[PDB]
Amino acid sequence: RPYYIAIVGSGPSAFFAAASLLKAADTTEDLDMAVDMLEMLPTPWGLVRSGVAPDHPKIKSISKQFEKTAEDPRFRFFGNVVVGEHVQPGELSERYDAVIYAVGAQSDRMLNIPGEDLPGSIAAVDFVGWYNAHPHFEQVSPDLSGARAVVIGNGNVALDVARILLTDPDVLARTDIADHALESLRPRGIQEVVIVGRRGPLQAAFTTLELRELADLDGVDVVIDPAELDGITDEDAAAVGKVCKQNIKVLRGYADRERPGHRRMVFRFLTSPIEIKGKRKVERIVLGRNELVSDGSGRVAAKDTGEREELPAQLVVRSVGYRGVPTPGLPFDDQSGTIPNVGGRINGSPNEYVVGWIKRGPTGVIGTNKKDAQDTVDTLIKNLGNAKEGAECKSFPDHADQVADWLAARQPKLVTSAHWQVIDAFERAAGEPHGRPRVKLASLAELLRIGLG
Numbered sequence: 001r002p003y004y005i006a007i008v009g010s011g012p013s014a015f016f017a018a019a020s021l022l023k024a025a026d027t028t029e030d031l032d033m034a035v036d037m038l039e040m041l042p043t044p045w046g047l048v049r050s051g052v053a054p055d056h057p058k059i060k061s062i063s064k065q066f067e068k069t070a071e072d073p074r075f076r077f078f079g080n081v082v083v084g085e086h087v088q089p090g091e092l093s094e095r096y097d098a099v100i101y102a103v104g105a106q107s108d109r110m111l112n113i114p115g116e117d118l119p120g121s122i123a124a125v126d127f128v129g130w131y132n133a134h135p136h137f138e139q140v141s142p143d144l145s146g147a148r149a150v151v152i153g154n155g156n157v158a159l160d161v162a163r164i165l166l167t168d169p170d171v172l173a174r175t176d177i178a179d180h181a182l183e184s185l186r187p188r189g190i191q192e193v194v195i196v197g198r199r200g201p202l203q204a205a206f207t208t209l210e211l212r213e214l215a216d217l218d219g220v221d222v223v224i225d226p227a228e229l230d231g232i233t234d235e236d237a238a239a240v241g242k243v244c245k246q247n248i249k250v251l252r253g254y255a256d257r258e259r260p261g262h263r264r265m266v267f268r269f270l271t272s273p274i275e276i277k278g279k280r281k282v283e284r285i286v287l288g289r290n291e292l293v294s295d296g297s298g299r300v301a302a303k304d305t306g307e308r309e310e311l312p313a314q315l316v317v318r319s320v321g322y323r324g325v326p327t328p329g330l331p332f333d334d335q336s337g338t339i340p341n342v343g344g345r346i347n348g349s350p351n352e353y354v355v356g357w358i359k360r361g362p363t364g365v366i367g368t369n370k371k372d373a374q375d376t377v378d379t380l381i382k383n384l385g386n387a388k389e390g391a392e393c394k395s396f397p398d399h400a401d402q403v404a405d406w407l408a409a410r411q412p413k414l415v416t417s418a419h420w421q422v423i424d425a426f427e428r429a430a431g432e433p434h435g436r437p438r439v440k441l442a443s444l445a446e447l448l449r450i451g452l453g
């Protein structure tokens with residue numbers, strides 16, 4: 001028999017793990033593999049579908065690789081299966097030789113400041129999910145009519161949020177953005193987005209192309225007060241690294257521009273949100289100025305000066321990181337939002353593993369998940385081999401049929417690969433006549449009406 005591996009999740013780390021497993025079988029005698037991928041949503045690809053911005057279709061093309069992997073007859077997909085709800089980790093661990101958790105980071109980091117819960121104060125996780133038609137975020141429905149939005153954070157997600165808020169809706173109308181978001185963006189209500197970073201430009205987590213592309217937003221001026229660069233030297237930037245050096249050159253270029261009438265994306269550094277205020281919804285934000293100080297760890301940290309400024313704003317999006325969510329039956333580190341593991345093996349488990357953002361934390365481009373997944377798979381395979389040599393492998397009967405019947409009993413509305421392919425075809429056909437790659441089905445009900453049909 002082949003080894004039977006379950007992968008929970010269907011994003012990049014899951015697909016890289018699947019490919020690694022199949023490659024091991026393809027290149028090793030007396031080693032065969034079967035992979036079942038269980039995904040919470042009806043649709044695969046994780047953040048490649050629901051995260052990557054709609055104005056970045058090229059980045060999403062990695063999905064073609066995932067499709068090629070899924071064509072393998074040893075691979076099966078079961079969508080609309082929520083591990084922790086329909087089936088439990090302890091059940092998967094009995095039915096498979098090994099289980100790989102590739103669940104990503106499904107929630108958000110909080111600011112932990114007063115007023116964070118007011119209507120109009122949301123996380124980028126929820127805003128992005130909403131504009132990318134993730135079914136869990138269909139009702140986020142932010143009011144985008146007010147003149148000023150504030151985005152907290154200095155990572156690339158903050159830039160995506162700002163771009164979507166300010167890009168000409170006629171441009172967004174040709175993307176796979178959610179129709180509900182397009183409708184809210186058509187009025188062009190937001191005139192200014194202020195991106196607020198707690199540390200300085202040298203500590204920004206932005207990457208360079210992402211900063212450069214802001215120059216190509218029709219109708220938007222990037223605004224950086226030259227004072228934001230005081231004390232920021234090219235020598236110190238180079239000491240941080242090559243990306244930082246390039247970033248600072250780009251930022252200086254923006255700061256060199258002096259304009260009324262245009263939409264504005266403003267960068268403010270050394271500033272922290274202190275409190276969000278308003279009567280029943282966000283109306284203003286209190287900001288504090290920071291200075292950079294060595295904390296003894298090898299970095300600089302922001303230290304509050306105590307100064308306070310209030311700025312009117314009608315939307316605050318915190319882009320201060322995604323965050324893992326605990327899975328019933330598995331260990332979890334609350335502080336980091338990751339599952340504790342050694343070489344990818346989950347603490348305390350002989351046959352459960354992690355890959356991707358749930359293993360490493362929520363950082364890295366798509367490709368950073370590849371070596372990560374390979375490393376975990378190498379450990380997994382070594383461990384199975386040891387078990388086999390010790391005559392400790394599970395005994396399984398037509399096991400593949402039996403596990404599929406169990407999944408169907410637990411989730412009669414599961415979505416197989418063939419049915420995902422119907423959803424996919426529906427969405428693409430909806431978009432292409434309108435110049436869009438696809439129009440996404442934005443709710444579970446709509447997805448299932450087509451997928452289960």
Ligand SMILES: Cc1cc2nc3c(=O)[nH]c(=O)nc-3n(C[C@H](O)[C@H](O)[C@H](O)COP(=O)(O)OP(=O)(O)OC[C@H]3O[C@@H](n4cnc5c(N)ncnc54)[C@H](O)[C@@H]3O)c2cc1C
Pocket residue numbers: 008009010011012013014038039040041044045046047048051052053056059081082083084102103104105106128157160322327355356357358363364365366367369
């Ligand atoms: C907003 C945003 C934009 C990004 N844009 C880019 C970009 O332009 N370029 C780039 O290279 N990288 C980009 N990235 C980074 C990229 O998205 C990540 O590196 C990558 O997706 C992480 O992969 P993952 O497999 O760990 O998690 P994910 O892609 O999040 O996949 C996790 C999967 O697990 C599923 N899942 C979760 N819990 C369960 C459960 N209990 N049961 C079953 N299934 C479950 C989810 O539904 C999902 O499909 C972006 C990230 C974000 C957040």
Ligand SMILES: NC(=O)C1=CN([C@@H]2O[C@H](COP(=O)(O)OP(=O)(O)OC[C@H]3O[C@@H](n4cnc5c(N)ncnc54)[C@H](OP(=O)(O)O)[C@@H]3O)[C@@H](O)[C@H]2O)C=CC1
Pocket residue numbers: 110111152153154155156157158160197198199203204205206207210272273319320321322362363364365
């Ligand atoms: N085009 C691309 O390549 C894209 C890639 N991705 C990537 O996905 C990953 C996730 O991006 P993202 O979610 O932006 O995460 P990042 O880790 O890149 O950025 C998080 C930001 O939040 C800041 N922050 C954290 N806590 C606070 C706080 N309490 N107050 C103020 N600021 C705070 C951090 O500042 P500090 O450094 O001070 O902690 C940092 O600027 C990144 O690796 C990113 O590059 C995402 C979008 C596009």
